[PDB]
Structures are given as structure tokens and as C-alpha cells.
């Protein structure tokens, strides 16, 4: 924590580069983490992969990209807001650009010999005592600008969060209560699918280990899992493909379908052999 | 912990060697540990051993090597990032290379008698009081460069982690949900195989000790292990060989196979006698 503490290099053309790096790089890392952790980017990638023909129209891809970027940008925005409200980065970056002519609150004692160097050295307390008033005059100005920018950022972000939702409810063909039900269903489906995938994988692995050694060393909960849930085989690759991708609220016979797993279960999702272990049986014969 | 504390030798052509050693050697050790602990390097070695003919193509070997190196390089990268953000190693290494002409923030009081020696002696507080400003001028510069490099490293690493995953999902023939299921299966298979190997070895050892002494002194849990899981013999060497190596998602009759243990259990993996205890029975007769 003390490692990432801000340390302004008081040098012209050098402090703003350090501020830019030390502020943007954490923001970029948070943006990357937000992109990676989201599962909507991955099924968007899966759609672009399996479609392989640019079949999807511009509107749905644009909507998904906007949603992913908006969900990811929460952490960079709040990090930037905190950094701006702190004021250290902005004063460090903009100390060297302060105009000596515009300086006030003291008689004109500011030298013009090396103006940029002294202005850049202000943050590190390396201010001559004869310019003790000027240093504070700049410190209260640049920090003010920093905090002003932070507050404007919070205002703009709040306005965007208000407007985006006000348009999302207005342009959606569904009611907001039905969309809340849909969100609840999506959360429950994701959690249940993950849990059952874990259990199914454990049971299959136990069967394989039993085939190898002749028995399996299982715990009591694992024994209950094996007894209650028996597995006969593995789901085919097309069955997995039928449930991976983006879904936009299709309706069948007046009844809503809330995911492509639901659509597949209803039966609305389901010659050439690929990535086979061995050749056709005719070739195996020879 | 205090043993590995950094101690800069303030001497020209000597401090950067110490910094290089004291930074790289921990990084090299962490890289070696990451390589060793991973089990993918070992089944890659097993493949190169049993194939013994360079049979594997360049693409799969390159992919496995890239994966192993990428997984191993996490600890060296974060260690280097922390060391760079600390700034001590970089300032110690680059103190002697600071150009006296480029020095500023003070009148030209820097001697040219032995410039390199004083510059190298800056880190150890052995700076003459007449150069007290120069020492700080260098301390805020070199440390800035160190921290800048650290932040650039974090940015590049984050970009690579984003791009590599974005390509891994794009070029993979499987969907991301199926790959998650595959990873869960691999973890469960590894844990179950280790546990059953331990239990099987314990039961076999108990049988041998019973053959020697006439009984075995077993604990209650060991008694349960012996009663529940009886062993009749040991698996042959080819049976072990059939499950050790690298596996790349073959598919049999439209059904996925997730490991070579699974492939062996399905029956798709299975004259000259090697490393025998005694000669052929014909030779034993004589």
C-alpha cells in the first residue's frame, strides 16, 4: 500500500508524464479486469467465433458492446474521481504550466530566470522562502481545478447513469417488472448451472478413477453426490454450443423464453465429423 | 527478512552489478519454482521422452511451452514490479550514470574531479553538504524513472493478459462454458486420482507388512480403508504410460473426451519384455 504512494518528480516535462502513468495505468488495469470478469464479452466473442460470417447486425453488437463497456468503466471512473479529488496528481502534472504573470497574492518577487523549473519544483516543498506565498498561491489554485474536475466528473457520470436507464426502460419492449423477473432468472440459472457442472464433473471423474484403480476414496458428501446423482455419459459438443452465445428475448407461441438454455430445453435449438480421435470405422478396419 | 534487506554498495561499476544480482536472482528463483511446481512441464517432458522421435508438431509444443512460461512468469513479473516501484534498486544501479551537465535546481557547484564516485556515493547519504541539493535532485529523478518503468510494466502485463485471453477464446474450437466444464473436470480428476493413489498405496503396503509380520497395526481410519478398499494387484507400466502425457481434446463418436485417463477408461488407449526381474522362464529353468 505504501508502495503505490504518490511521489511527484519535481522536474519540468517529467512530472506530468509520471502523473499520467500513475493515474492511467491503474485505471487501465481496472478497465481490463472489468472487461475480463464479465461473461458478456465472452459469449459475444463466442458469437463472433461461431457465426464466422459477420451475420449479426450492427444494432445488437453495438448494444452489447455498450453494455460491456459501461459495466467495466465503473471502477476506472471512481478511481479517476478519487485521484482528481485528492489533487496531488493534478497539481504535480500542472505545476510547470502555471503562468508567472497570472500569479498574485504577493508583490512581483517571482524570478523569470528559470520559471518552469521553480514552478515544477513547487510540489516537493523545494520552494525558496522568498516565494513561500507564491507556492501556496499555486497550491490552492491547481488543487481547486483538480477538485472541480472531480465534481464535474461525478455530475456527468450521474447524469449518464440517469439518462441511460431512462432510455433503457423507455425503448425496451418489455415491462420493468418482467425484466426484473428475467434478471432473477438469469442469476439463478447461472448459479445452478455452475453448481451442477461441478457436481457432474466430480461424478464423471470418480467413475474414471474407479475404472482405473477399482475403487474411489470419497468423502461422505462425495458419497452422497455419487449415490444421488449418477452420470451415464457426456453431453455432445453441439449441445454445449447450442447454449453459448448472446440471446435477445425470443418468444415462442406467446410464451417468453429467457435464455438459450431455456430455448434449448424447450426443443427450439437442436454427416460431417470434426476433431475425431480416430478415422472412420472403414479406415480403422485397415 | 532483514537478511534480504537492500544495501547499496556506493561504488562505481559496482552498485549496478549488486542491484542486478539482488533483483534478478529472486526473479530467477521464482521463475524456476513456477516452472517446477507446474505439472504441464512434466507431462511435456514425458511426451518428449516416450515419443523419442520428435513426433509432435511445432504448434502444440509451442502452445504448451507458451502456457507453461506464461503461468510461471507471474511471480517474477510482480516481484520486478514491486522492486521497480520501490525505487531503491534502480537509483542504486543508475546513480553513477547521471550526467553532471544535466544537473539543475542549484548553481553549478558540482565538481568534475571525480564525478562518477560522488554520483555513485549519493545513495548511501555520503553526499557533501555543499551538494545536498544535487543529491535530492538525482534522488527525485532516478526514482521517478524507476516508478515510471514499474507502471509501464503493469500496463504492458495487463494488456498482454487481456490480449492472450481474447485470442484464446477466439481461436479455441470449443465454447467458453464447455472449457470451464473441462477445467472443473481436470481439477476434480487430479484431486481424486491423487487421493485414490494414496489409499491404494497404503492398502498395498499394509498387505506387504501383513505378509511379513503376520498382522498390521492399523488405526481406525486405516482399518476402514482396508475393509472398504481391497487391492488385488498393481497396475502395469503400460497402463500408467497410457495416462501420462499431453492431451488436446480428441472426440470419439461425437462424444467429448476430456483427458487421457478418460480416453483410456473408454478403451481408446490400450512380445518384448523390458526391465524384468529375472530372465525368461526358459532361462530360469537353467
Amino acid at each position, epitope marked *: 500500500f505504501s508502495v503505490v504512494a504518490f511521489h511527484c518528480p519535481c522536474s519540468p516535462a517529467r512530472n506530468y508524464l509520471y502523473g499520467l502513468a500513475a493515474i492511467g495505468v491503474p485505471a487501465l488495469v481496472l478497465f481490463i479486469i472489468g472487461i475480463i470478469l464479465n461473461n458478456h464479452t465472452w459469449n459475444l466473442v463466442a458469437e463472433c467465433q461461431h457465426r464466422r460470417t459477420k451475420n449479426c447486425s450492427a444494432a445488437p453488437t453495438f448494444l452489447l458492446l455498450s453494455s460491456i463497456l459501461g459495466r467495466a468503466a465503473v471502477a476506472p471512473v471512481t478511481w479517476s474521481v478519487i485521484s482528481l479529488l485528492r489533487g496531488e496528481a493534478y497539481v504535480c502534472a500542472l505545476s510547470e504550466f502555471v503562468d508567472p504573470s497570472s500569479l498574485t497574492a504577493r508583490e512581483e518577487h517571482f524570478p523569470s530566470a528559470h520559471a518552469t523549473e521553480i514552478l515544477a519544483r513547487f510540489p516537493c516543498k523545494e520552494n525558496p522562502d522568498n516565494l513561500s506565498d507564491f507556492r501556496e498561491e499555486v497550491s490552492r489554485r491547481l488543487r481547486y481545478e483538480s477538485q472541480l474536475f472531480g465534481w464535474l466528473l461525478i455530475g456527468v457520470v450521474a447524469i449518464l447513469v440517469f439518462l441511460t436507464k431512462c432510455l433503457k426502460h423507455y425503448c425496451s419492449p418489455l415491462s420493468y417488472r418482467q425484466e426484473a423477473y428475467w434478471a432473477q432468472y438469469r442469476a439463478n440459472e447461472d448459479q445452478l448451472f455452475q453448481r451442477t457442472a461441478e457436481v457432474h464433473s466430480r461424478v464423471l471423474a470418480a467413475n474414471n478413477v474407479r475404472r482405473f484403480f477399482g475403487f474411489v476414496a470419497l468423502n461422505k458428501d462425495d458419497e452422497e453426490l455419487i449415490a444421488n446423482f449418477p452420470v451415464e455419459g457426456t453431453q455432445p459438443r453441439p449441445q454445449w454450443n447450442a447454449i453459448t452465445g448472446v440471446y435477445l428475448y425470443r418468444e415462442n407461441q406467446g410464451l417468453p423464453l429467457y435464455s438459450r438454455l431455456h430455448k434449448w430445453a424447450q426443443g427450439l435449438a437442436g454427416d460431417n465429423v*470434426e476433431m*475425431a480421435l480416430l478415422p472412420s470405422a*472403414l479406415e480403422v478396419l485397415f | 527478512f532483514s537478511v534480504v534487506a537492500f544495501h547499496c554498495p556506493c561504488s562505481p561499476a559496482r552498485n549496478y552489478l549488486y542491484g542486478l544480482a539482488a533483483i534478478g536472482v529472486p526473479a530467477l528463483v521464482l521463475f524456476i519454482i513456477g516452472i517446477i511446481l507446474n505439472n504441464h512441464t512434466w507431462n511435456l517432458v514425458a511426451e518428449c521422452q516416450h515419443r523419442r522421435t520428435k513426433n509432435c508438431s511445432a504448434a502444440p509444443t509451442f502452445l504448451l511451452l507458451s502456457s507453461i512460461l506464461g503461468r510461471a512468469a507471474v511471480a517474477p513479473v510482480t516481484w520486478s514490479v514491486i522492486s521497480l516501484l520501490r525505487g531503491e534498486a534502480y537509483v542504486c544501479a543508475l546513480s553513477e550514470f547521471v550526467d553532471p551537465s544535466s544537473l539543475t535546481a542549484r548553481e553549478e557547484h558540482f565538481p568534475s574531479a571525480h564525478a562518477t564516485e560522488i554520483l555513485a556515493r549519493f545513495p548511501c547519504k555520503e553526499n557533501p553538504d555543499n551538494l545536498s541539493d544535487f543529491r535530492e535532485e538525482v534522488s527525485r529523478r532516478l526514482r521517478y524513472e524507476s516508478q515510471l518503468f514499474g507502471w509501464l510494466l503493469i500496463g504492458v502485463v495487463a494488456i498482454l493478459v487481456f490480449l492472450t485471453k481474447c485470442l484464446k477464446h477466439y481461436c479455441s474450437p470449443l465454447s467458453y462454458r464447455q472449457e470451464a466444464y473441462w477445467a472443473q473436470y481436470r481439477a476434480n480428476e487430479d484431486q481424486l486420482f491423487q487421493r485414490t493413489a494414496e489409499v491404494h498405496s497404503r492398502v498395498l503396503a499394509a498387505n506387504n507388512v501383513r505378509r511379513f509380520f503376520g498382522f498390521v497395526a492399523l488405526n481406525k481410519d486405516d482399518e476402514e480403508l482396508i475393509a472398504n478398499f481391497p487391492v488385488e494387484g498393481t497396475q502395469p507400466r503400460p497402463q500408467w504410460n497410457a495416462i501420462t502425457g499431453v492431451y488436446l481434446y480428441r472426440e470419439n463418436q461425437g462424444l467429448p473426451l476430456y483427458s487421457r485417463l478418460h480416453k483410456w477408461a473408454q478403451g481408446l488407449a490400450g512380445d518384448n519384455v523390458e526391465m524384468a526381474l529375472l530372465p525368461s522362464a526358459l532361462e530360469v529353468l537353467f
Partner: nanobody
């Protein structure tokens, strides 16, 4: 794209002769694997015979050598099989299968195309 029509099934006692035909319709240019398979309840599916259009050679199973034969009509693009010296062990479902080579890339595996057709052949005694 390619369909196989199989015919000739029936009930013949032991020692009889049967001629089963399989006609291919579609893109038969790329097919290099022509053969027949038999499967019975309670057991898996095995191949009686197959032939090579590309190379010319042929394989018969151990139970097929000297008993049953398979011929190909290139002009008709059809497969004919002659069951001679029928036995009660031949009561099984019979299929004719076609495969178009198969190219192995090391990273992904074997890829090809395969076709099938459902038929039966049961011997009373």
C-alpha cells in the same frame, strides 16, 4: 448431400445366397471408403468388408474370408455384397457406409465426412 439406399434384406435359411445392394446418390467423387457393417443386439458394430477406390485393395473380416464377397460397380456407383454359406450368426442389422478420406491436422484432429444407411438381414435357420 450424399444418400445411400440399401436393399435386399430378407429371411434365408442356412447355406443360402443373398445379394444386398447399396446405391449412392450425390457427390461420390470424393468418397474413398466403401464398406459394409453389421451390428446385433447385445453387441457393438463390426465391419464385414470394405474396399479402396483410391488404391484398389480390399479387406474382409476373419469370418468373411472364403464365405462372403463384396464388389463395386463403378459405372453404377453402387456396392453389391454376396452372402454365401449363410449361418445363424448372420442375424444382424446391416449398413453400407461411405467416407471421404480424412485429413489430420495435429492441433485439432481428424476431419472427414461419413454416411450411413439402415438395413437388416436375419437368417431363420
Amino acid at each position: 448431400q450424399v444418400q445411400l439406399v440399401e436393399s435386399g434384406g430378407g429371411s434365408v435359411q442356412a447355406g443360402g445366397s443373398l445379394r444386398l445392394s447399396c446405391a449412392a446418390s450425390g457427390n461420390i467423387r470424393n468418397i474413398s471408403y466403401l464398406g459394409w457393417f453389421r451390428q446385433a443386439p447385445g453387441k457393438e458394430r463390426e465391419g464385414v468388408a470394405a474396399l479402396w477406390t483410391t488404391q484398389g485393395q480390399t479387406y474382409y473380416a476373419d469370418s468373411v474370408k472364403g464365405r462372403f464377397t463384396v464388389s463395386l460397380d463403378n459405372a453404377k456407383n453402387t456396392v453389391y455384397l454376396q452372402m454365401n454359406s449363410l449361418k445363424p450368426e448372420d442375424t444382424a442389422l446391416y449398413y453400407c457406409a461411405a467416407a471421404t478420406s480424412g485429413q489430420y491436422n495435429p492441433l485439432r484432429g481428424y476431419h472427414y465426412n461419413e454416411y450411413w444407411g439402415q438395413g437388416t438381414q436375419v437368417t431363420v435357420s
